[PDB]
């Protein structure tokens, strides 16, 4: 009966095509049902990718239009994935799978790894807490840590719906002109802090850290500040 | 100052866009202009850069081979030409100037940044496409500890009706994956009859008669009413 | 010839020299500009790649010179005369030339010649004119605060230095920035702070911005700063620093230089080109016409290029000013003199304290 069996390059760079090969035996991939990817991010969620069917037509998931192909070699009864312009989130770990009514039978999966070089130009930005009840009067204080050093490099920003971002605080510690004085920023190290010193209702907004050490800008995921 | 965006539009998967962000106000030869997106819903993210006075660009890896920044200096114009779009690019452009200075001394690095003036952006969608969405599955009681021969249940929450197209997964602390119940209740081939599946419409659920080793495991659900199919979060079963 | 050049350069320019020398050679000569071209230089050089010629300001060339990617180079007691003999002190390290003064940059001061059609020749003046400004609702100067470059030339002025040079070298271990004179000279600044005539947050963004909207009579900035001040419409003149207690004040110098790489086939060519093609009065021209280079280092050239007296005021302060060491104990001078700065200004430390604990 039916056996799948991934294999392919473990390891992709950011903005390179991801190959994976579905060797089938057993049966034939002409003679009926549906060829699929699947793939399982790290933190353990199931994304349904794509297929091809038994007749070559093709069904992929509208969150990967336009950079996904799935295509098969007939003769060698193997049927293909490739993904193009990959980011750090397409790391994981990637499945095929025979389709009728579920996915009855599946490979046993490959681990797929995008990941840069990248060294010194690779900097993330992690801002906590992601989310902030407040009220007006409170000290609010927002934390970012950098993935390396930036030195003085960060910046932040204030951002209301529908509206474009405002510029806070430049260097870390300078208040830009026309902000409030109750807007402080300072550094610890790879440590960024945001200081309102105390809050105001028309304060109430996302704030997002940012730094430009490296040529690779990066923002934060942001804070959201919310009244009750 | 002002920063003015234009060239948005829905476009199909896989299309084209240019986008421009026409400046006044400031010396644009002696600037950096910025371009920073937004997907409905979520966080700024910095997308592509271009110094007017070195002529140095600079992507994210994210848009890396697929945008081109580009300015032209008599115009006070910038311009990002995006190719192979997909539903991960659908966002609000905005086109920002870089103020700083450089280092004179090694190692010339950039002092005082900051994005001061920021347009007011312009939407790109890209549409979804002729496909359908989403369905979410809710799963839960995810990883409760049980004891070796109790009776569990795991259960999955549809956000719409599914007509009772609803499997289930066991996925082992290896890897391996292997398919449990399709269409609510049937066994498939193999699968030990202590499994069983109820439900209709929205809700549905699969039992576990008595508790074995071997079902230590991660358990899926699955949608298959509509494309594109879409999976539960994954219960996770441990043992007390 | 391959030749790397900073994108912000006359690098057409310079392509248009490389084509006279093939037509008078036969040597094609390719000029490029990669992107953190300073970075890339010594990774590929170690290898025994990259360009025959790399262009950048002297600092980095210390760096490159200790690890032997520089040749060292061979001009004439003639050849050397025809550029300033300060500028052949910027390019030297452990003694031996390393690389051929281009051009010479330096801060100057600034101001508006509408508020201050005369401005002060001495920093002592400045306290009197802020007041004279305050009842007109502006100020007399402001300029970065925050970073020892833009600070120094007032401290240097009388006495201070970040490292003795003497014959070709720097003596690491005798540093002057907490001898009297850089005392004399920070206190001078504190002071300014203390009467309220300058702001301790001043920084370049918010004195730039003061500047070109008319609201300051004077700022002290670099060649880079004046295309926005054309843009500002402010009608201004630069000219040489204030002296202060009668000396000069002394800005750090950096020299646009030209080395060679030591794993280059075509040293010999690489000399022909530089001597006697780009550092002629024609070969300037051509890469200045493309993309200025403010005040150069051969002396025919400059005599021409300081018609217009902002180029004058350059060199004239970079002839009174310190040429920056190219050592990478530098390094912990930026840092130290910076916290030292920032201590005095505030008042956490007295100028005494805070020097002290920067020689250290």
């Not at chain 2, 081979?65 to 690019?89: P, V």
């Not at chain 3, 690098?11 to 000029?31: C, Q, S």
Request: contains cysteine; aromatic residues 12%; glycine residues 10%.
């Amino acid at each position: 009966q039916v056996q799948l069996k991934e294999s392919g390059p473990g390891l992709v760079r950011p903005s390179q095509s991801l190959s994976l090969t579905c060797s089938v035996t057993g049966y034939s991939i002409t003679s009926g049902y549906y060829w699929n990817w699947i793939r399982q991010f790290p933190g353990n969620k199931l994304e349904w990718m794509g297929y091809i069917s038994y007749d070559g037509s093709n069904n992929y998931n509208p969150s990967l239009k336009g950079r996904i192909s799935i295509t098969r070699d007939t003769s060698k009864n193997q049927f293909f994935l490739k993904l193009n312009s990959v980011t750090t989130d397409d790391t994981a770990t990637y499945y095929c799978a025979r389709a009728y009514i579920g996915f009855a039978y599946w490979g046993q999966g490959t681990l797929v790894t995008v990941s840069s070089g990248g060294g010194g130009s690779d900097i993330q930005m992690t801002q906590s807490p992601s989310s902030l009840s407040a009220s007006v009067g409170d000290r609010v204080t927002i934390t970012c840590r950098a993935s390396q050093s930036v030195s003085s490099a960060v910046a932040w920003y204030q951002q209301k719906p529908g509206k474009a971002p405002k510029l806070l605080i430049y260097s870390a510690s300078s208040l830009y002109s026309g902000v409030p004085s109750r807007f402080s920023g300072s550094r610890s190290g790879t440590d960024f802090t945001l200081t309102i010193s105390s809050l105001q209702p028309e304060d109430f907004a996302t704030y997002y850290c940012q730094q430009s050490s490296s040529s690779l800008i990066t923002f934060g995921q942001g804070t959201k500040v919310e009244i009750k | 100052v002002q920063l003015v965006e234009s060239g948005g539009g829905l476009v199909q998967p896989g299309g084209s866009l240019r986008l421009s962000c026409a400046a006044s106000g400031f010396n644009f030869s002696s600037s950096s202009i910025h371009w920073v997106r937004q997907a409905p819903g979520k966080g700024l993210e910095w997308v592509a850069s271009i110094s007017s006075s070195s002529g140095s660009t600079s992507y994210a890896d994210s848009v890396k081979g697929r945008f081109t920044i580009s300015a032209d200096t008599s115009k006070n114009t910038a311009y990002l030409q995006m190719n192979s779009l997909t539903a991960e690019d659908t966002a609000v452009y905005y086109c920002a100037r870089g103020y700083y200075y450089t280092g004179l001394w090694y190692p010339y690095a950039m002092y005082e940044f900051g994005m001061d003036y920021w347009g007011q952006g312009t939407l790109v969608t890209v549409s979804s496409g002729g496909g359908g969405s989403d369905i979410q599955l809710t799963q839960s009681t995810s990883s409760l500890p049980a004891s070796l021969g109790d009776r569990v249940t795991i259960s999955c929450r549809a956000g719409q009706d599914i007509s009772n197209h609803l499997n289930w997964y066991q996925q082992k602390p290896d890897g391996t994956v292997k398919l449990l119940i399709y269409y609510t209740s049937r066994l498939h081939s193999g699968v030990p009859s202590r499994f069983s599946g109820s439900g209709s419409g929205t809700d549905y659920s699969l039992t576990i008669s008595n508790l074995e080793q071997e079902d230590i495991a991660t358990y899926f659900c699955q949608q298959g009413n509509t494309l594109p199919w879409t999976f539960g979060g994954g219960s996770k079963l441990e043992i007390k | 010839l391959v030749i790397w050049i900073n994108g912000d350069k006359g690098y057409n320019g310079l392509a248009e020299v490389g084509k006279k020398f093939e037509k008078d050679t036969g040597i094609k000569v390719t000029v490029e500009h990669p992107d953190k071209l300073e970075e890339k230089f010594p990774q590929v050089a170690a290898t025994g790649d990259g360009p025959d010629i790399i262009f950048w300001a002297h600092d980095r060339f210390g760096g490159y010179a200790q690890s032997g990617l520089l040749a060292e180079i061979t001009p004439d007691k003639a050849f050397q005369d025809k550029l300033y003999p300060f500028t052949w002190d910027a390019v030297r390290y452990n003694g031996k030339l390393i690389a051929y003064p281009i051009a010479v940059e330096a801060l100057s001061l600034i101001y508006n010649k509408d508020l201050l059609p005369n401005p002060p020749k001495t920093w002592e003046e400045i306290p009197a004119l802020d007041k004279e400004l305050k009842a007109k609702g502006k100020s007399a100067l402001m300029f970065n605060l925050q970073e020892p470059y833009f600070t120094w030339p007032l401290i240097a002025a009388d006495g201070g230095y970040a490292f003795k040079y003497e014959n070709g070298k720097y003596d690491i271990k005798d540093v002057g920035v907490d001898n009297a004179g850089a005392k004399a000279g920070l206190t001078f600044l504190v002071d300014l702070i203390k009467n309220k005539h300058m702001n301790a947050d001043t920084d370049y963004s918010i004195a730039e911005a003061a500047f070109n909207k008319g609201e300051t009579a004077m700022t002290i900035n670099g060649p880079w700063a004046w295309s926005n001040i054309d843009t500002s419409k402010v009608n201004y003149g630069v000219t040489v620093l204030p002296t202060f207690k009668g000396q000069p004040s002394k800005p750090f110098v950096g020299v646009l230089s030209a080395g060679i790489n030591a794993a280059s086939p075509n040293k010999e060519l690489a000399k022909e080109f530089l001597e006697n093609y780009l550092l002629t009065d024609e070969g300037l021209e051509a890469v200045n016409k493309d993309k200025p280079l403010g005040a150069v280092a051969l002396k025919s050239y400059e005599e021409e290029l300081a018609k217009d007296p902002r180029i004058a005021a350059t060199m004239e302060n970079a002839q009174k000013g310190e040429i920056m060491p190219n050592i990478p104990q530098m390094s912990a001078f930026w840092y130290a003199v910076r916290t030292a700065v920032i201590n005095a200004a505030s008042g956490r430390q007295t100028v005494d304290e805070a020097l002290k604990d920067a020689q250290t």
